[PDB]
Amino acid sequence: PETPQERKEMASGVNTRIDDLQMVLNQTEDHRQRVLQAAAKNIRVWFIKVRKMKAIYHTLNLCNIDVTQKCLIAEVWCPVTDLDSIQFALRRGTEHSGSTVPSILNRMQTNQTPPTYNKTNKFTHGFQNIVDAYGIGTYREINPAPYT
Amino acid sequence: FVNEVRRCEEMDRKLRFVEKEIRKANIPIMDTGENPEVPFPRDMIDLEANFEKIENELKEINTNQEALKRNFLELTELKFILRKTQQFFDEMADPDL
Amino acid sequence: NKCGFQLQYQMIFSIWLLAFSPQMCEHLRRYNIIPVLSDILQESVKEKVTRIILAAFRNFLEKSTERETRQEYALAMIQCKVLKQLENLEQQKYDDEDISEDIKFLLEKLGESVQDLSSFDEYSSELKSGRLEWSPVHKSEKFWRENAVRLNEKNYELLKILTKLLEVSDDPQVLAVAAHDVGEYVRHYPRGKRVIEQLGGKQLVMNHMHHEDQQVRYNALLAVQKLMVHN
Numbered sequence: 001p002e003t004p005q006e007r008k009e010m011a012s013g014v015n016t017r018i019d020d021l022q023m024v025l026n027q028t029e030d031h032r033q034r035v036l037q038a039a040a041k042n043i044r045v046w047f048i049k050v051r052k053m054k055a056i057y058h059t060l061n062l063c064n065i066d067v068t069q070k071c072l073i074a075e076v077w078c079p080v081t082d083l084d085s086i087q088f089a090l091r092r093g094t095e096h097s098g099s100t101v102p103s104i105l106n107r108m109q110t111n112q113t114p115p116t117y118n119k120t121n122k123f124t125h126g127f128q129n130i131v132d133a134y135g136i137g138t139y140r141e142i143n144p145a146p147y148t
Numbered sequence: 149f150v151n152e153v154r155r156c157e158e159m160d161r162k163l164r165f166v167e168k169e170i171r172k173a174n175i176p177i178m179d180t181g182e183n184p185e186v187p188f189p190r191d192m193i194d195l196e197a198n199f200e201k202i203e204n205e206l207k208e209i210n211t212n213q214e215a216l217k218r219n220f221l222e223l224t225e226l227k228f229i230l231r232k233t234q235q236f237f238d239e240m241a242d243p244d245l
Numbered sequence: 246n247k248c249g250f251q252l253q254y255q256m257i258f259s260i261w262l263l264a265f266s267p268q269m270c271e272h273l274r275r276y277n278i279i280p281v282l283s284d285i286l287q288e289s290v291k292e293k294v295t296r297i298i299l300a301a302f303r304n305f306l307e308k309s310t311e312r313e314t315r316q317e318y319a320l321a322m323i324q325c326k327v328l329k330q331l332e333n334l335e336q337q338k339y340d341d342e343d344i345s346e347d348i349k350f351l352l353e354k355l356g357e358s359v360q361d362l363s364s365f366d367e368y369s370s371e372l373k374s375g376r377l378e379w380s381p382v383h384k385s386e387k388f389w390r391e392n393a394v395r396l397n398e399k400n401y402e403l404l405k406i407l408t409k410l411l412e413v414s415d416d417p418q419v420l421a422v423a424a425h426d427v428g429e430y431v432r433h434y435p436r437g438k439r440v441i442e443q444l445g446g447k448q449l450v451m452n453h454m455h456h457e458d459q460q461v462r463y464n465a466l467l468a469v470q471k472l473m474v475h476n
Contacts, residue, residue, distance in 0.1 A: 003245050007230060014227045017473075020451065021220040024469055025213065027454065031466065032209050033175070039166055039202050040175050045182050047163055049195065052186045054156035057149040066340055096188060098250050098291075151336060190287045193333060212470050219473065 079117055114139045155192070162199040169206055250291055257282065257297045264304030271310050274317070278305075280325040287330065292339065299334075299347040302327070306354055319358035323381055328355045363388040365395050372406045377422035383429075393434035404430065404437075404444055411449040421464040424450050428468030438472070447472060 001007040063072040078086055087105045094103045116136050120128050124145060131137075131145045170177055248256075260278060263269045282298045289295075302322065309315040322328070331352050339345065361367075363385040371380055382388050396403040407423045407430075414420040427446045430437050441447055450472070453465040 001230070001233070005245065007234065011227070011230045014223045014230065018220060018223045018227060021216055021223065021473055024454070024466070024473065025216050025220060028209055028213065028216070028466060028470065031463075032173075032206075032213075035202070035205060035209075036170060036173055037175050039206075040170050040177050043163060043167055043170065043177055044179065045184070046195070046199065047160075047167070048183060049186045049191075050156055050159045050163060050199075053192060054153060054160065056186070057152045057156060061149045061153070070340075155336075189290060190333075193287065193330065212474075215474055216470070219476065222476075 077115055116140075118143065118145070152192075155196070159196060159199055162203045166199075166203050166206060169210070250289060250294065253285065253289055254291070254294050254297055257285075257294065257301055261297055261301040261304055264301050264308060267308045267310045270305055270308045271314060277321075279318070279321045279327070283322070283325040283327050283330070292344075295334070296339075296344050296347070299344065299351060303347050303350055306351070315354075316358060316361065319355060320362065323355060323359060323362075327351075328359075331355065359385065365392040368392070369403060372403050375410070375419065377410065377419040377426070379418070379422060383422060383426065386433075389429050389433045393430055393437070396430060396434075397437075397440070401440060401444070404440060404446075408441070408444040408446045408449060411446060411453065417458040417461050420453060420456070421458070421461045424453055424461065424464040424468045428464070428471045431468070431471045441472075 001010050060072075063074045065072060076086075083105070090103050090105055116139055118128055127148050128143075128145045131143070131148055137143055167177070263273060278301070282301070286295055286298045302318075305318045306315050309318055331348060334344075334348050335352060359381050362380060363382045365388065367380075368382045368388065371377065371382070377383075407426055410419060410423045411427065414423060427441060427450055431441065447469075450465045450468045453461055454469055456462050456465060
């Protein structure tokens with residue numbers, strides 16, 4: 001300012017506005033706190049859900065599609081002992097789909113080589129990794145892990 | 149389904165941005181360990197709305213906070229200068245103005 | 246009662262058959278079909294179900310007798326958030342031009358309906374009647390950017406209505422809407438900051454930020470934030 005009344009005008013204009021802006025800053029920061037707490041309470045489940053949906057869509061993109069048949073075609077490797085449980089998972093999926101007419105799980109004569117699986121446990125994981133470090137054993141050859 | 153994959157990546161970007169802001173903030177992330185299998189019905193749209201709104205409001209408040217901070221600090225300094233100016237005139241107050 | 250998939254599909258098929266005609270379309274509005282089918286179109290994802298709801302909506306908008314009648318149906322749909330799921334289905338693709346045409350028709354007509362709702366005359370009518378209840382014009386930025394000056398007509402009659410409601414309103418919805426509209430007026434007519442100062446909207450929103458309702462506080466805080474952005 002240049003004059004006493006100008007000085008008083010500016011002084012009042014800033015004295016109201018500073019308190020107003022501090023008030024809004026503090027309340028909006030409290031709003032940040034509330035909404036960010038609400039987000040953090042659930043983000044992990046949100047992360048898991050979005051990642052699961054991503055995985056589901058990506059794996060679905062491996063099937064053959066309406067270009068071949070309106071129903072999808074897929075192919076899987078599985079341990080034999082769990083065929084019943086896999087069919088039960090298929091049953092669960094169809095139940096969630098709500099269709100009366102059911103799905104089907106099919107065996108077939110195969111030319112591709114089976115993978116190797118070991119049903120590792122907490123104690124033997126390190127040793128199984130140690131023997132895997134030099135090449136995984138062929139289907140059903142003796143595992144050096146239990147002796148190592 | 150790659151389009152749905154792209155939508156999931158947009159969702160993951162939203163969530164990771166919010167997670168980074170949470171890390172920058174002091175509030176903890178909870179580690180409850182809930183592991184549901186996501187259903188088929190379009191919960192995706194509800195979750196997209198929720199993530200979009202959460203991240204959008206976070207962005208808007210974050211941006212507005214800086215401007216309010218700047219203006220408040222400017223007005224504080226102006227108040228201080230206005231205070232000291234009269235002391236600088238403190239000699240003899242005969243004139244009406 | 247949420248019957249099975251086939252029963253739902255057949256019942257919406259019935260609705261589509263009825264909607265093929267103007268008179269029955271006009272008289273069966275009383276059952277508020279649109280919201281229930283809006284939720285069902287997301288829950289009952291089955292393509293037959295989705296297609297038949299979209300076809301029923303298309304028939305409704307086709308055979309509604311008046312422009313106003315089609316506008317009630319479209320306004321109900323937008324209030325029930327049909328348009329966003331129409332966008333999502335547009336992102337999606339299906340194996341016939343029929344679903345494509347249904348989606349495109351509903352999309353274009355929803356766009357036209359929101360454009361009609363965005364009329365500044367209808368905004369004036371809503372303000373005059375006090376129906377500050379989140380009509381799409383309120384969140385249509387296109388209306389605001391162009392018409393924010395027009396609120397100054399009749400010696401700022403619309404702004405006076407808004408500011409008067411910002412002290413008279415006990416209704417949370419009306420009060421929050423008025424606060425948000427003051428914020429938008431600030432956002433889209435920069436010269437109006439002195440006008441709102443003169444009308445007291447500045448102080449009214451600064452007070453309603455402390456309102457007892459979370460939504461009123463939220464909107465008032467938004468508006469006051471937009472207010473203090475500049476010296």
